[PDB]
Amino acid sequence: QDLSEALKEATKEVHIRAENSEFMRNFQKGQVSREGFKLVMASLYHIYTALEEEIERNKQNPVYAPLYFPEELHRRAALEQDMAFWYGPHWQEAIPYTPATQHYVKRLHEVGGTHPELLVAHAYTRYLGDLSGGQVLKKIAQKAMALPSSGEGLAFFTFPSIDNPTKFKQLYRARMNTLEMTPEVKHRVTEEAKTAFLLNIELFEELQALLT
Ligand code: HEM
Structure with missing residues (x-):
């Protein structure tokens, strides 16, 4: 059984649970607000920063190298643009760094520094989702918050270096x-x-609590 199939099958259950967290449920219904959106995106900024720092550290390691696609997939740059859009010119000192976000970042560093053979699990979880369902979330956010088709504020969900997400996903x-x-x-x-x-x-459970 291929790893790609093993991963999809192994996480299809928890995926259903994640979609139904209170925060994501509200999001899907289009009840996502600027304050709530800012919290999640700021958190993703930290998460992807840690993930990609670990990817760079292990770029030449065979247990991860075949998945090294910075130009097509890496999100840090896009999230930095989004942060400037939502938080302003001084976002670096304005964005939150929640405990759940810190917890996620901590595991990412443990994996990248001590268990690099597991880094693929984290890249799969975030990137493959972004390339698939993330496109659905993007449409929902645009409609909910009146974000321009031109892409501002949603750079994270835009992959300009990839013609077709479905094609890249297969690759x-x-x-x-x-x-x-x-x-x-x-x-x-x-x-x-x-x-x-x-x-x-x-993270989603924490953010919803912070919101309510
Ligand atoms: C409520 C928000 C979400 C919606 C609506 C959603 C929906 C989807 C959709 C439509 C697909 C494609 C299904 C397919 O090809 O069979 C997908 C795939 C995926 N999603 Fe989500 N998703 C959500 C939340 C998440 C979260 C929170 C994660 C984990 C950070 C995630 C990670 C993934 C992954 C890794 C895949 C690719 C599965 C694979 O092909 O192996 N999704 N999602």
């Missing part, structure tokens, strides 16, 4: 399936992917 999956795999690695990667989903749900 990314194929490359994921070239990683040297053993029962040991496959089992732990799928487990870490479930943990990654949980970290996201915990």
Whole structure:
């Protein structure tokens, strides 16, 4: 069984749970506000910054190298533009760094620095979602908050270096399936992917509480 398929099957359950968190449920209904949107995007800024810092650290490591697509996938630059859009010229000192976000970042660094063979679980969880359902969330946000089709404020959800997300996704999956795999690695990667989903749900639960 290919890793790409093992991951999808192993996280399809927790994915349903994540979609139904209070925050994401409200979001889907289009009840997402500027204050709430800012909290999640600021948090993603920190998360992707940590994720990509670890990706760079392990770019030449075989347990991750085949998935090294900075130009097409990396989000930090886009999130920096979004931060300037939502928080202003001095966003760096204005954006929040919540406990749940810190917790996520902590695990990302543990994985990247100590268990790099599991980094793929975290890139899969975030990037493949962005390339698929993330496009749906993008439309919802635009409609809800009157964001321009030109893209301002939603750079995170825009991949200008990729013609077709569905095509790249298939490529990314194929490359994921070239990683040297053993029962040991496959089992732990799928487990870490479930943990990654949980970290996201915990972030969403925290943000909703901060909002209510
Ligand atoms: C309520 C918000 C969400 C919606 C509406 C949503 C919806 C979707 C949709 C429509 C797909 C494509 C289904 C398919 O190809 O069969 C997808 C895939 C995916 N989503 Fe989400 N999603 C949401 C939340 C999340 C969250 C919170 C994560 C974890 C950070 C996530 C990660 C993924 C991943 C990793 C995939 C790719 C699965 C695969 O093809 O292997 N999604 N999502």
